[PDB]
Symmetry: C3
Subunit: 322 residues, 3 copies
Amino acid sequence: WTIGIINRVVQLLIISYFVGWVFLHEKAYQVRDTAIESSVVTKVKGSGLYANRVMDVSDYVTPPQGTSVFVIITKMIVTENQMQGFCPESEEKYRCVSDSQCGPERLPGGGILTGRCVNYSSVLRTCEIQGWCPTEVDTVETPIMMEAENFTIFIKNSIRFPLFNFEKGNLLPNLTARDMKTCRFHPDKDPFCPILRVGDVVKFAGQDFAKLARTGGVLGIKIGWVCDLDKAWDQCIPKYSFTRLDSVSVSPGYNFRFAKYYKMENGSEYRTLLKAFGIRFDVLVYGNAGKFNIIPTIISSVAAFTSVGVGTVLCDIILLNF
Amino acid sequence: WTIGIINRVVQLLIISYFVGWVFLHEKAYQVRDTAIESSVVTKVKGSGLYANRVMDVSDYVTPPQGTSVFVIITKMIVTENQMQGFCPESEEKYRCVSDSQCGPERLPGGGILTGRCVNYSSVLRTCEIQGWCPTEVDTVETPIMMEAENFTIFIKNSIRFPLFNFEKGNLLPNLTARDMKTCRFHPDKDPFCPILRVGDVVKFAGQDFAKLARTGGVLGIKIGWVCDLDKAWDQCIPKYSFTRLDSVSVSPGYNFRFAKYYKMENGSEYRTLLKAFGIRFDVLVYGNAGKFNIIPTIISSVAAFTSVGVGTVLCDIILLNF
Amino acid sequence: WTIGIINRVVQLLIISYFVGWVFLHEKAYQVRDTAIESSVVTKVKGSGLYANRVMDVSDYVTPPQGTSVFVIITKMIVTENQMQGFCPESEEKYRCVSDSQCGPERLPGGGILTGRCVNYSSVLRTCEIQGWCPTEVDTVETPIMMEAENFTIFIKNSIRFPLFNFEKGNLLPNLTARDMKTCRFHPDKDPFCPILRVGDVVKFAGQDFAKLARTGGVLGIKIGWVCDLDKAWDQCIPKYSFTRLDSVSVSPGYNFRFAKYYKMENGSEYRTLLKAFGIRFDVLVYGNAGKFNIIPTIISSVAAFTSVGVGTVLCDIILLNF
Ligand SMILES: *[C@@H]1O[C@H](CO)[C@@H](O)[C@H](O)[C@H]1NC(C)=O
Ligand SMILES: *[C@@H]1O[C@H](CO)[C@@H](O)[C@H](O)[C@H]1NC(C)=O
Ligand SMILES: *[C@@H]1O[C@H](CO)[C@@H](O)[C@H](O)[C@H]1NC(C)=O
Ligand SMILES: *[C@@H]1O[C@H](CO)[C@@H](O)[C@H](O)[C@H]1NC(C)=O
Ligand SMILES: *[C@@H]1O[C@H](CO)[C@@H](O)[C@H](O)[C@H]1NC(C)=O
Ligand SMILES: *[C@@H]1O[C@H](CO)[C@@H](O)[C@H](O)[C@H]1NC(C)=O
Ligand SMILES: *[C@@H]1O[C@H](CO)[C@@H](O)[C@H](O)[C@H]1NC(C)=O
Ligand SMILES: *[C@@H]1O[C@H](CO)[C@@H](O)[C@H](O)[C@H]1NC(C)=O
Ligand SMILES: *[C@@H]1O[C@H](CO)[C@@H](O)[C@H](O)[C@H]1NC(C)=O
Ligand SMILES: [Mg+2]
Ligand SMILES: [Mg+2]
Ligand SMILES: [Mg+2]
Ligand code: NA
C-alpha cells in the first residue's frame, strides 16, 4: 500500500526534523576548545584624598605592574615608627593575671611572648612580646578614600584559542560607540568599552561602595569569550559580567599588611606598619570556541541516523497497535 | 524454535548488562566542563625569630596581597649598605691574573667589569666591577626561622563552572568537624578545614622542614573539584592534595633578591641587598563537572544499541560454530 | 553472482580504509585532557648600565619572586623627592585662564585640584593641585638599558595532566645538546634548553629591542604540551613558541608607576616617583594529552561501522545506476 510509505515518509520527515533541529542546535557537528590562553593587562587611573594626604596610582595600587589581580587601597591603618624591642601587646585576648599564663603553651600560633605579664595600660594587663614596638591597635575607626569610586580600570585582554590557533584582543574600536580614550563600559550603551568605572564595577556586582570600601572585598571582572569559529572573526566577541567572589563564621572583607622600611642615621631599623583594606579585582577570562569537524560531525550523524531508524519502528508499533 | 529467542533473549540480557554498566560507569550520558574559573585568596598567620629579630607577616610574606602564589621567607642573606661605586667582586670565578683577562669577552652575562684586576682580599684577586659596593658573599651559612613551621595558611577559594554557571566556595562549616576559626586541615579528621598548618603541608608533600627551610622550595596545595552536577550542591566537594613541584644538574631550592632602598641626608643612595630563601606556595585549583545532556546521552545510546546488535551475531557465530 | 561479493568486498575494503585512516588520524579512540595544571618559576640573570648607575636583578626585575608574569625594567623616569603640598601641574591639558575653569567639573578623573589657576612656568598657566610636589613631567626623553638584551630568562615549568595524573617537568638533560647550566634555547639547535636569551625571545616574537626597550611591551613565552599518553613518557615534550601580545587608537607600550618611600629625620614624608618602562614576560602554559579509552573507542567504532554500512549501499546505487 502506498499509504505505508506515506506513513513511513511522514515518519521520516517529522522524526528527522526533530533530531535535526536538536543536533543543529547543540552544534554536535563541532569540536570545542575550552582552554583559553589569555593575557591580561590592567591600568588604573585616579587620585583620591585620605586624611590630609593625596593618594595616587603609586600609593593605593598594589601590585603596581597591572597583573590579572590587583588591589585599590581604600582604607588603611598606620602604626608608625615600630622598632624591634619589648612591649606589652594591646589585644585583650592576651590578657594575663600572672607570668604563669604567658608561657609558650598559650597562644602558640601568635607572636613571640617574653614571659612577662606587663601593664599595657592601666585598664589592661597583657603578656609582653618581642618584636615591632609598639604593637598594632587594629580596633580603631578610620576614614575611607571616596574618590576611588570615580577611579577607572582599563582592561586590555589578548586571548588565544590554541586548538585553532585563533588569537584576538578585546580592543574593538568599531564595536565601541565612542572613542577608546573616552568611552566607559556600560553593559547596554557600550558593552565593548574596555574601560570600567570602579563604582560601576561595584554596582554591576551588586555592592555598596561605602561598606565595601570600609571592609574591603574581592570582585571579579569576568570576561567571557564564547565563539563559533565557523563564523566570522567579527563574531568572536567578549562579554563582560561582574560578580563578588568573597560573598558570605569568618569575618567578610579583605586586608593585608605591608611595612615601609626606613633606617636611621645611626643605623637602627624602623618601619611604618600598614594594615590595608581595599578592593581586589580578579579578571577571570573564560572562553570556549567551536569549529566544524569531520569526526564529531560523523559521530553526531551516525547517532541521528540510527536514532530516527529506531523511532520509525517504535512509532509504527504505537500507531498500528492503536 | 523457542530456544532461539531464549538464546537470543539471553544474548541481549547479558551483553546489554555489560555495555550498560560500562557506559553507566563512565557517565557517557554526561557533558563535562573542565575549565574551572577559580579565585584564590590566602592568609598567613604567625611570628618567628630570625637572629635577634622578630619576623611577622609583613616581614617574611611576599607578595603581601595573598595571591595564588606567595612566599614565606625562612632564611635570608643580608648585604647591608651597598653603594654605587667600584669594588672587586668576591666570586672566585672572577679570579684574574692581569687586566688582560678582565675584558668584555669574559663572563658576558655577568655584572659590569671595570677592566681592572684588583685584590678583593690577600688570598683572591678578582676583576673589579661597577655597581652596588661592596659585593654579595653568597657562600656563608645562616640560620633559619623555625617558627615558620607552626605558621598557618588559610585558603579561601571561590570557583565557578561556567558551562553550567555553577559557582561555589570551599568554606563549608557543616563539613568541618570543628569551628572554622579554630579547625586545622587533617586529610582524615578534618579534610574540609581550609586552614593548613605550614609544617603539615610540608609533610603532606613528603618533605623535611629543615632541609626545605634551608634551601627553599616550591609546594603545591592542590585543590580538586571533581563534581557531578546531576547530583546535589552538597556533593560538589573540594579535595586537598599536596605535592612538591621543583622535585629533582641544576641546584634545588628557591631564592630571589630584593633590596630595601634607603637614601641619605646628603642624598646619596644605598640599599640593603636581600637574598631570600623560603617556601613558595602555589594553590593549583583543578576541577571538572558533569551534567546529563541529551546529545551525549544520544551518542552513547546509539553506540550501545549498535554494539550489542553486533555482539549477538558474533556470539551466535561462536556458539553455533562450536 | 560471485562478482557481487567481489564488488561488495571491494566496497568494504576501500570505504573502510578511508574511514579507518581518518579516525586513526584524529585519534577518535582517545579521551583528551585540556586542563593543564602548570607551575612556573623564572629566574633572570644580568647586570646593565642606566645613566651612571648599575642595575641588577633586584633593581630592574619586578616582582622579584619569579612568577609567571614579571617585568625587566629597561627605561625609567625619576621624579625625585616629592612631598605632599600644593603646586601647579605641568600638563598642558590642565591649562587654565582663570580659577573659573579649574572647578571640580573639569577633568573629574584627574588629580586633586585646589581651584587656583597658578603659573607653572612663564609659558604655561595650569590649575594648582594638592599632592606629591613637584609634579611629574612625563614628556622628556631618557636612555634605555641596552645590557638587558644579553640578560637571560630561565623557565622551570612543572605541569600535571590531572585526568591521567601525569606530571612532568621541562628540565630534560638528555634532550639538551649541551649542559643545562650553559645551554641557550635555540628553536633548532637546542629547542629544549629552558634558558632563553632576552634578545632572543625578542626576535622569536619578531620585535626590535630598541623600540621595545624604548616604549615597553608584553611578550609571551608560550610553552606547549601536546601529548599522547598512549606513547612513552619520553614523548611528552614541551615546544616553545613566542609572540607579542599587546600588538596594535591607544598608545602601544607598557609602563607602571611605583614610588620608593623615604622619611626625614624630622618626620616629613617624601618619595621618589618612578614611571617604569620595560618588557613584561607572560609564560603561557598550554597543554592537552590523549589516552586510549574504551568509551570514545566505542563511539568512534560504532560511527565507523554504520558509516561504511551506508556507504556501500549508496555506492551500489551509483555504480548500478550508471
Ligand atoms: C608549635 O607549637 C607547639 C605548641 O602548640 C609547640 O609545643 C611547638 O614547639 C611549636 N613548634 C615549633 C617548631 O616551635
Ligand atoms: C573596523 O572598521 C573599518 C571601517 O573603517 C572596517 O573596514 C573594518 O573591517 C573594521 N574591523 C572589524 C574587525 O570590524
Ligand atoms: C639609635 O638612635 C636611637 C635614637 O636616636 C636610639 O633609640 C637607639 O638606641 C640607637 N641605636 C643603638 C644601637 O643604640
Ligand atoms: C652581548 O655579549 C657579547 C659577548 O658575549 C657582546 O659582544 C655583545 O656586545 C653583548 N650585547 C650587547 C647589546 O651589549
Ligand atoms: C548547613 O547546616 C544547616 C544546619 O543548621 C543545614 O540546614 C544546611 O542545609 C547546611 N548547608 C549545607 C550546604 O550543607
Ligand atoms: C654623602 O655622604 C657620604 C658620607 O656621609 C659620602 O660618602 C658621599 O660621598 C656623599 N655624597 C656625595 C655626592 O659626595
Ligand atoms: C565623580 O565625578 C563627578 C564629576 O564627573 C562628580 O560630580 C562626583 O561627585 C564624583 N564622585 C565622587 C564620589 O566624588
Ligand atoms: C636520560 O639519560 C639516561 C642516560 O644515562 C637514560 O638512561 C635515561 O633513560 C634518560 N631519561 C630520559 C627521560 O630520557
Ligand atoms: C621637616 O623639614 C623640612 C626641611 O628640613 C621642612 O620643609 C618641613 O616643613 C619639616 N616638617 C614640618 C612638619 O615642618
Ligand atoms: Mg594585634
Ligand atoms: Mg656574587
Ligand atoms: Mg602628569
Ligand atoms: Na555514535
